[PDB]
Structures are given as structure tokens and as C-alpha cells.
Swiss-Prot record, chain A:
List of residues binding Ca(2+) 2: 127, 129, 131, 133, 138
GO biological process: cell division; centriole replication; microtubule cytoskeleton organization; mitotic cell cycle; mRNA transport; nucleotide-excision repair; protein transport; regulation of cytokinesis
Entry keyword annotation includes Mitochondrion: no
Binding site for Ca(2+) 1: 18, 20, 22, 24, 29
Principal place of residence: cytoplasm
Compartments, record wording: Cytoplasm, Cytoskeleton, Microtubule organizing center, Centrosome; Cytoplasm, Cytoskeleton, Microtubule organizing center, Centrosome, Centriole; Nucleus envelope; Nucleus, Nuclear pore complex
Family: Belongs to the centrin family.
Stated role: Plays a fundamental role in microtubule organizing center structure and function. Required for centriole duplication and correct spindle formation. Has a role in regulating cytokinesis and genome stability via cooperation with CALM1 and CCP110. Involved in global genome nucleotide excision repair (GG-NER) by acting as component of the XPC complex. Cooperatively with RAD23B appears to stabilize XPC. In vitro, stimulates DNA binding of the XPC:RAD23B dimer.
Protein's name in the database: Centrin-2
SMART domains, sorted: EFh (SM00054)
Gene label: CETN2
Family matches, as InterPro entries: Centrin_CML-like (IPR050145), EF-hand-dom_pair (IPR011992), EF_Hand_1_Ca_BS (IPR018247), EF_hand_dom (IPR002048), RNA-helicase_DEAD-box_CS (IPR000629)
UniProtKB/Swiss-Prot annotation, chain B:
Organism, scientific name: Homo sapiens
Claim: Zinc is one of the keywords in the record: no
Subcellular location as annotated: Nucleus; Cytoplasm
Subunit structure: Component of the 7-subunit TFIIH core complex composed of XPB/ERCC3, XPD/ERCC2, GTF2H1, GTF2H2, GTF2H3, GTF2H4 and GTF2H5, which is active in NER. The core complex associates with the 3-subunit CDK-activating kinase (CAK) module composed of CCNH/cyclin H, CDK7 and MNAT1 to form the 10-subunit holoenzyme (holo-TFIIH) active in transcription.
Family membership noted in the UniProt record: Belongs to the TFB5 family.
Name of encoding gene: GTF2H5
Protein name (Swiss-Prot/TrEMBL): General transcription factor IIH subunit 5
Function of the molecule: Component of the general transcription and DNA repair factor IIH (TFIIH) core complex, which is involved in general and transcription-coupled nucleotide excision repair (NER) of damaged DNA and, when complexed to CAK, in RNA transcription by RNA polymerase II. In NER, TFIIH acts by opening DNA around the lesion to allow the excision of the damaged oligonucleotide and its replacement by a new DNA fragment. In transcription, TFIIH has an essential role in transcription initiation.
From Swiss-Prot, chain D:
PROSITE patterns attached to this UniProt entry: HELICASE_ATP_BIND_1, HELICASE_CTER
One GO location term (cellular component): transcription preinitiation complex
GO terms for biological process, alphabetical: apoptotic process; DNA repair; DNA topological change; embryonic organ development; hair cell differentiation; nucleotide-excision repair; positive regulation of apoptotic process; protein localization
Protein name, entry field: General transcription and DNA repair factor IIH helicase/translocase subunit XPB
Predominant subcellular localization, coarse grouping: nucleus
Ranges for domain Helicase C-terminal: 433-593
Misc note: The TFIIH core complex from patient XP11BE (a patient with XP/CS who has a C-terminal splice-site frameshift from residue 741 in this protein) reconstitutes in vitro transcription about 30% less well than wild-type but does not restore NER in vitro or in vivo. The XP11BE TFIIH complex has all the subunits in the same stoichiometry as wild-type. Purified mutant protein has very weak 3'-5' helicase and ATPase activities. In another paper the mutant protein has wild-type 3'-5' helicase activity. The mutation is recessive to wild-type. Conventional DNA helicases unwind DNA by binding to a ssDNA overhang of dsDNA and then translocating on this strand with cycles of ATP binding and hydrolysis to 'unzip' the dsDNA. XPB/ERCC3 is believed to be an unconventional DNA helicase principally because it translocates in a 3'-5' direction along dsDNA instead of ssDNA, thus it is referred to as a DNA translocase.
Species this protein is from: Homo sapiens
Length: 149, 67, 85, 614
């Protein structure tokens, strides 16, 4: 089970870019196609997904590929929303970052007995820019490379 | 006023949670668990209660042994 | 030295009586000078791997701790969504 | 013929005779035999049926035994012929004996005692007085591959022949297919190749009547014969093994599950056998003794079954064992043998007499029929209720305590369909409160409390919350022994949590209260064995019918119910009853853990934190 009414939206979006009824849409029309159904990809992600869909260099994909890509993007988008909610749970002070104090407080909330050195090690390990904490982008990255979700 | 006529069922709260699970998972199909009334009572439609009784009986059959 | 198939003998330099019996005291390994330089560079490189072998093993643990940590909150979060007032 | 009610109409084939009260036996043509314990002739019929029939059910009044070809061969090995057995059955059968049953006995008895296997000079010879059957056996290609041949590929020539040692087990399965079971007869007194051992029985050793009876059944015509003997835990099984070893007085090898069992056996032999300690050696990975001069050896299956490279000394020990000819070998917990690695040990070791002792034989993998040829037919199995009446064993008081599941737990119990569902019902807060109340009750009663929990996490959680010692996976041996000795003597410690390791990995100090929380999933033999091992006869409460107390905490409406019912199948077959108790008086008065709801909610959080990975 994936979607029942959102699949109609994807079909209609495919038909909007397939008014001539050729069965496929241009890959260059995928950028607007994501915008029509609510997706707002970045240019680097657009290039990355064009590389995956168009490994053969055809430039056109059938409805199956478009539907699969749209479902994957929807899943990633709701996953990012849930990760943002989890960060806000971490971000009790609304600072946008999970500092060492925030991590310690939220860990003591669960009653966990993780050592403070381990806490700062976790902060540094998931820290990428070296600011001393973990950012929203870095938290998204650590969730993507997490064990599962 | 809008007052409904159905069937009242009284059982253990574990069975209440079982019925909640059935409604949420829609194992019965359509959402026939219209409204809960008490921690030990529920109010359903008599149309599908018979089949619901079958599913309840199947569960306790699973938690048993055949000789 | 075993990896490089070079003769390697522990240098017995003393003897300790601890534990109620005299026990050998070893001071490194005596290896032929000709292979010595060849033996040294690998060993450091060997260590250069092993320490990294340690580091990854730590990180592989620490990553799991994140999975151990956040998920523990998630259910604690999820429970708050299912019994919260 | 089958009636419409499902009962098989046996009236036509069972002509009743007017000797009703005098004759206590019913002989159904299905092979099942029924005996009335209230009959004045119960004892004689009981003794007769023990040798000839395999027990099935031994409740208070009506006992059911079964007839198998293995039972008939065991009876023949005892020395009973067809005519006397048939006459005794007729004098005891209420109705006429079916001819098909008679024909089945006729077919089995004639083929018994035909093929004999003898081990001499590390060579196995198959011999018979009838070369016609011997020549017929030469036809089987499996036998042809099994029969020892020359290094040139040519088969070798009262006529016998050597047999390949590594092909013995497959031949044994073929013998049943050939309907000619092997005869495991040992020259108890006629042996000259293996010298005797200066080992005797100390006067402190006393043989109980059933023990002596089982030994006499084993030693048919004064000759030791391989077989399987079932003794309840705490019935001096080790004493029986030491007695048999002293009787044979030849080279004796014993196999145990763990080094703790090895030490128990060594202490038993020091306690009863007169053999010098210098001739006693343990082939253990930690305590090593030279195989030279080791008149009696005690080892473990893993040491002999260590397929991977072993220590160089272990190589020498194995070589000495292979060179050594074993007149006698002793195997413990025979139900473990059907495993392939432990079965290979039998091929590895060249032994004449192999006797297996255990408390149970109901393998959930039903790998017992082939076990009849790995060792032999079941020689004896005592009546547990009879030993209860005789006072040899404590009369166990068994209870099944139903703990309703918390609805939040129950909703999650329904939610999970995977193996993670085990933690849901094994961590019931209501079950926790019931356990706490029972522990308080028995501590106020000043009883030894043993809490059995298969799940490691559940056991540790319960022990930590209740502040009691816990035993789990690693269980460093020094700490384990320290805790055990504290439990035996220190009055402050009377509640011990033991994980699955408590079954056979070590001896359990005698207790009176055994509470089982976690189940393997239906191990009707393992948990019954552990229960029998836990509870033993206690002085002071001998007069009372309930001197031992066992309670099983079962989560209601869970899959644990089916597991408990399947598990207690064997114990019910043993005549043990289980009373169901739902309401525990006194819990409301006492204050116990998780009194408030959020405490149980917090426990649910903790358990759910342990996801499917844990
Ligand atoms: Ca924060
Ligand atoms: Ca950052």
C-alpha cells in the first residue's frame, strides 16, 4: 500500500506533460512536474535524479518510472518532515541546532545513562561543518545514513 | 437529536483494545466500530457484529491447543 | 614478522619470580638487521591500519548509539502521541 | 472398523471371557494396552507390562502402555519367550487376544537374536548361526559398501566378517530395513582382552528397589547389554551409573553436557566407587589429565565432537581413546544425542557397552526411533507417582497462574506479529506484581525461590527491579559458584534468577519453590527436565502430599497459553496435575511494584525500546 488518491495526482501531472499522448514525458519537463505536485527539488538533486532516471540517455520515461520517482520523493519528503519534528523535539529551545546541553537534557528525559563524553562524541561525529553541534542538514544526513527509519 | 440504535457489548478491556485494533487495521473491512462508550463497553452496529464474533472466536482459538 | 616470514625471536633479558615461580622476562624481539628496516616500515603501516581498524569499530558503535538514542525517543514520542492528554 | 462416534469398533475381534474382575488387562488390537491400578493383581501386571510394553500414560487409575518391536526385542533381551508372554496376556486380557497382535508378536520374536555384532581387536564382526540370512544380507548394496573390504577393493570372507567402523550407523538403520536388529551382547565375565579395574562399591552405597530392578533388567543373564534407562532427576541417577560402572569393572567412559556434570560424576565416584583417584581423569579443556592410566574417563560431547582443530594434547588423548578398547561407555541426557555432531561421537569412540541415562525422552524433533539403534531400546522408566508415594521423591505441588495482560500491552501484543511479540507477553506488569507477591509470600514462608526465565533481558530486568541475583549468558564461573554457595547457606539469599543455562549446564541446589516466567516456546521436555532437576525430596515435609511447590506464570489470552498446554502434555502423561489459579489472595493488601499506571507505562516504554534487534 502506497497511495490511492495521490496516484491520481501523479497520473494527471503526467498527462499534463503528455498532452500529445506519446506515453512519455521529457526529463527536462520533470523539474516543473515536481513543482506541479508540490515537490521543490534543488538543482543538485535535480541533476542527481536525472542521472538515475536517464542512465540510458533517452531523455524520456514512461508512466511507471514517473510514478515510482514521485512515490520515492513523497516518501523522502514525509521522512524529512518527521525528522524535522524529531529535531524540534530535540530543539526545545528553538535554536535550530542540537547542542550538547540539548542532547544531555533530552537524554536525561528518557533516563538514559549515556556518558557525557559519549554525548559530545555523538555530537562531534554527526557534526560536519565543525561548528561543535549538529545542524538541520547534518541531522538529515545522519538520519539518512542511520541504521533504518 | 441524532441518537444511534445499535448493540452494546461488554467485555474485558483487552477485548476492547482488540476491537480497536480491528477497526484501525480495518481487518473487518468497513469501519463498523462507530463509537466507544466506556473503558469496558463499546457500541457497534448489529449488522456486522456476528462476523466480528467470528473473528473474536478465532483469536481465542489461536491462543489454545488442539488435541 | 610472521606476515613477512622473517625470523623473530623474543629477547629474554631477565626473570621474574612473581606468582611463586620464576617467569621469563622478554624485551622485544631480536630480528636480523638486514630485514630490520623492511620489518619496521610494515609494522608502523600495520599499526597505521590497526588504529584505523579501532576507529571505525568505535564509529560503527557510535552510529548505532544514534540509532539507539533517537529511536528510543521516537517510541517515547509515539507513546506521547497515543496516551498524551 | 470405525464407528460414527470415532471409536474403533473392536468388539468383533475381542471375544470377551467371563473372567472380568480377575483379569485386569485390556488388549486393544491397535497395540495399546490398558491396566487398572485398583486391581488386586496390579503389581504383577505392572511388572509384566514394564518389560514387554512401552508406557504411554500413567495416571492415578487407568494406565496405558504401548507395544513396539523395540519393546519386544528388549523383552527378548531380558530373556522372555513368546509362549510365556502370550499365556500371561491371555490370563490377564479381559477379552480374546487379537490374532493380528499375536501375528505381530510372532513375526517380531522369531527375527530377534539372529544377528550379533562383536568388537574385538578394534574390529567389528557380524555373525550368526544361520549363514542363509548372512548370505542374504550380502545382497544389500548398502551393506556391500558398509562391509569392510580389502585395500584392493575386494570384500573379505559360524562365519563372520569385519565391518567398517565409519559405516556402522548407516548399517544400523539398514538392519531395521532388513528387519534384523543387532544384538548388543557383552561378555560381562568372559572378557579377557580388557583387564579389570580395582574399583568396587563402598558400603555407603544403597540401591533402592527400583534401581536394583532396573540394573537387573539391564544385566540380562549376568551379561551387560547396551540400552537406555529413564530415571527421574534426583533419583540417584549418578549413583546408578557409578554402580553399573563398578559392576562391569572394565574400561569406563562417561559423557556429560558441561564440566559441572563432569565434576559431579567425579565426586559421585569418589563418594561411592573404590577406584583410585589417580585412575580418574577428566578430558576437560581447563582441567587436563593424561589419558595414561585413566581407568575411568569423564568427558563432554563438545570435547569429543570438536571438529575444528584441537590442542595437540587433545590429539594425543583422542589417539589413546581410539587405541583404547572400551568395554563400557556411559551417556547422559540421551535426548541430546540425535544431533549430528554428538552422533558422530558414537562413530568416533569404539565401545562395547553403551548405556544412556536421562530423565526424559520426548524430543520435539521426534528423532528417537533412530535413537533406538544408536544405543538400544529403553530398558526401564520408573513411575513418578509411585516414587512420590514411596517417598523417594518430593511430591510436587503444581500450579498454573493466569496473569491478565495489560490492555495497552495487549493492544501492542496484537499489533506485533513477529518474534518481537515474545517480549510483550513475557514482560507483563501484572505478571510482575504476581511474581513479587509470590516471592514475598514464600520468603515469609522461608523457602528457596528459583526464578526460571529463558529471555535474558526479561530475567535481568526482573532481577534488577527485585534486587536479586541473576544468571545469564556468560555467567563467569567463579561468580556463578559464589552465588550458588551463598544461596545454599546464606539465609539472606533465597531468591535466584536462572536463565536457560540452568537446565543442564550446572547442578541446581535443592529448592522448594520454582517459578517459571519465560518459555522456550513449547519445549515440553526441556522445561519438564529442568523442573524435575530443581525439585528434590525434602525432609520434614515428607508426610504432607505437597512438599515441593512449582508455579508457572502464564499470560492470559496470549500464545503463551498454547505453549503452556503443549508443554504440560508430558507432565500430565506423567500423572502430574496443574490447577489453574486466576485470583491471588493477599495481593491487594500488599504494596507491589507498578502500582500506578504510568509505572506500567514506563515499563512499556522500556520494553518497546528493546526493538526486534534485541
Ligand atoms: Ca536545541
Ligand atoms: Ca552544523
Amino acid at each position: 500500500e502506497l497511495t490511492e488518491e495521490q496516484k491520481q495526482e501523479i497520473r494527471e501531472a503526467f498527462d499534463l506533460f503528455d498532452a500529445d499522448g506519446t506515453g512519455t514525458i521529457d526529463v527536462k519537463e520533470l523539474k516543473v512536474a515536481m513543482r506541479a505536485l508540490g515537490f521543490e527539488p534543488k538543482k543538485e538533486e535535480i541533476k542527481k535524479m536525472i542521472s538515475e532516471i536517464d542512465k540510458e540517455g533517452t531523455g524520456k520515461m514512461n508512466f511507471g518510472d514517473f510514478l515510482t520517482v514521485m512515490t520515492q520523493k513523497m516518501s523522502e519528503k514525509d521522512t524529512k518532515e518527521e525528522i524535522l519534528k524529531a529535531f524540534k523535539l530535540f530543539d526545545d529551545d528553538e535554536t535550530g541546532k542540537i547542542s550538547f546541553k540539548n542532547l544531555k537534557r533530552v537524554a536525561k528525559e528518557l533516563g538514559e545513562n549515556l556518558t557525557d563524553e559519549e554525548l559530545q562524541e555523538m555530537i562531534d561525529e554527526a557534526d560536519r561543518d565543525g561548528d561543535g553541534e549538529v545542524s538541520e542538514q547534518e541531522f538529515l544526513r545522519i538520519m539518512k545514513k542511520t541504521s533504518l527509519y | 437529536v441524532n441518537v444511534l440504535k445499535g448493540v452494546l457489548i461488554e467485555c474485558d478491556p483487552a477485548m476492547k483494545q482488540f476491537l480497536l485494533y480491528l477497526d484501525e487495521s480495518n481487518a473487518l473491512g468497513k469501519k463498523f466500530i462507530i463509537q466507544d462508550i466506556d473503558d469496558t463497553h463499546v457500541f457497534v452496529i448489529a449488522e456486522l457484529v456476528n462476523v466480528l464474533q467470528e473473528r473474536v472466536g478465532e483469536l481465542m482459538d489461536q491462543n489454545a491447543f488442539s488435541l | 614478522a610472521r606476515k613477512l616470514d622473517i625470523d623473530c625471536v623474543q629477547a629474554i633479558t631477565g626473570f621474574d619470580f612473581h606468582g611463586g615461580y620464576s617467569h621469563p622476562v622478554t624485551d622485544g624481539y631480536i630480528v636480523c638487521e638486514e630485514f630490520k628496516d623492511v620489518l619496521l616500515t610494515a609494522w608502523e603501516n600495520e599499526q597505521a591500519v590497526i588504529e584505523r581498524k579501532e576507529k571505525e569499530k568505535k564509529e560503527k558503535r557510535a552510529l548505532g548509539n544514534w540509532k539507539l538514542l533517537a529511536k528510543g525517543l521516537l517510541i517515547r514520542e509515539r507513546l506521547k502521541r497515543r496516551y498524551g492528554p | 472398523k470405525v464407528d460414527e462416534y470415532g471409536a474403533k469398533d473392536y468388539r468383533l475381534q475381542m471375544p470377551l471371557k467371563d473372567d472380568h474382575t480377575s483379569r485386569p488387562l485390556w488388549v486393544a488390537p491397535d497395540g495399546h494396552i490398558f491396566l487398572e491400578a485398583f486391581s488386586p493383581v496390579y503389581k504383577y501386571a505392572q511388572d509384566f507390562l514394564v518389560a514387554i510394553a512401552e508406557p504411554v500414560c500413567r495416571p492415578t487409575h487407568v494406565h496405558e502402555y504401548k507395544l513396539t518391536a523395540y519393546s519386544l526385542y528388549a523383552a527378548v533381551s531380558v530373556g522372555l519367550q513368546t509362549s510365556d508372554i502370550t499365556e500371561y496376556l491371555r490370563k490377564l486380557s479381559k477379552t480374546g487376544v487379537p490374532d493380528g497382535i499375536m501375528q505381530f508378536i510372532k513375526l517380531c520374536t522369531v527375527s530377534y537374536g539372529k544377528v550379533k555384532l562383536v568388537l574385538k581387536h578394534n574390529r567389528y564382526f557380524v555373525e550368526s548361526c544361520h549363514p542363509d540370512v548372512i548370505q542374504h544380507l550380502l545382497q544389500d548394496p548398502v551393506i556391500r559398501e558398509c562391509r569392510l573390504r580389502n585395500s584392493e577393493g575386494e570384500a573379505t570372507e559360524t562365519v563372520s566378517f569385519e565391518v567398517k567402523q565409519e559405516m556402522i550407523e548407516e548399517l544400523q538403520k539398514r538392519c531395521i530395513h532388513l528387519e534384523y536388529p543387532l544384538l548388543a551382547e557383552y561378555d560381562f565375565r568372559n572378557d579377557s582382552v580388557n583387564p579389570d579395574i580395582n574399583i568396587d562399591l563402598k558400603p555407603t552405597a544403597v540401591l533402592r528397589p527400583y534401581q536394583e530392578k532396573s540394573l537387573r533388567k539391564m544385566f540380562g543373564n549376568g551379561r551387560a547389554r547396551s540400552g537406555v534407562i529413564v530415571l527421574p532427576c534426583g533419583a540417584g541417577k549418578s549413583l546408578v551409573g557409578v554402580t553399573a560402572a563398578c559392576t562391569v569393572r572394565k574400561r569406563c567412559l562417561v559423557l556429560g553436557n558441561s564440566a559441572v556434570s563432569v565434576e559431579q560424576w567425579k565426586a559421585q565416584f569418589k563418594m561411592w566407587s573404590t577406584i583410585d583417584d589417580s585412575q580418574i581423569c577428566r578430558f576437560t579443556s581447563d582441567a587436563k589429565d593424561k589419558p595414561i592410566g585413566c581407568s575411568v574417563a569423564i568427558s563432554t560431547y563438545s570435547m569429543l565432537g570438536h571438529t575444528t582443530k584441537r590442542s595437540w594434547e587433545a590429539e594425543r588423548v583422542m589417539e589413546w581413546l581410539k587405541t583404547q578398547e572400551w568395554g563400557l561407555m556411559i551417556l547422559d541426557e540421551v535426548h541430546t544425542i540425535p544431533a549430528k555432531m554428538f552422533r558422530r561421537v558414537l562413530t568416533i569412540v569404539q565401545a562395547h557397552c553403551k548405556l544412556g541415562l536421562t530423565a526424559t525422552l520426548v524430543r520435539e524433533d521426534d528423532k528417537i526411533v533412530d535413537l533406538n539403534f544408536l544405543i538400544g531400546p529403553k530398558l526401564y522408566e520408573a513411575n513418578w507417582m509411585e516414587l512420590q508415594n514411596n517417598g523417594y521423591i518430593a511430591k510436587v505441588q503444581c500450579a498454573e497462574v493466569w496473569c491478565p495482560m495489560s490492555p495497552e500491552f495487549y493492544r501492542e501484543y496484537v499489533a506485533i506479529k513477529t518474534k518481537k511479540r515474545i517480549l510483550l507477553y513475557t514482560m507483563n506488569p501484572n505478571k510482575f506484581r504476581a511474581c513479587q507477591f509470590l516471592i514475598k509470600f514464600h520468603e515469609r514462608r522461608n523457602d528457596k525461590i528459583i526464578v526460571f526465565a529463558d529471555n535474558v533481558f526479561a530475567l535481568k530486568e526482573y532481577a534488577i527491579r527485585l534486587n536479586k541475583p541473576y544468571i545469564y549468558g556468560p555467567t563467569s564461573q567463579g561468580e556463578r559458584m559464589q552465588i550458588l554457595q551463598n544461596f545454599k547457606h546464606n539465609p539472606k539469599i533465597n531468591t535466584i534468577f536462572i536463565s536457560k543455562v540452568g537446565d543442564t549446564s550446572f547442578d541446581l541446589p535443592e529448592a522448594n519453590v520454582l517459578i517459571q516466567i519465560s518459555s522456550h516456546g513449547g519445549s515440553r521436555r526441556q522445561e519438564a527436565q529442568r523442573l524435575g532437576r530443581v525439585l528434590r525430596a525434602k525432609k520434614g515435609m515428607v508426610a504432607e502430599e505437597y512438599n515441593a511447590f512449582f508455579y508457572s506464570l502464564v499470560s492470559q489470552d496470549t500464545q503463551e497459553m498454547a505453549y503452556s498446554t503443549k508443554r504440560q502434555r508430558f507432565l500430565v502423561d506423567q500423572g502430574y496435575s496443574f490447577k489453574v489459579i486466576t485470583k491471588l489472595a493477599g495481593m491487594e493488601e500488599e504494596d507491589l511494584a507498578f502500582s500506578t499506571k504510568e509505572e506500567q507505562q514506563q515499563l512499556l516504554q522500556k520494553v518497546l525500546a528493546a526493538t526486534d534487534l534485541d
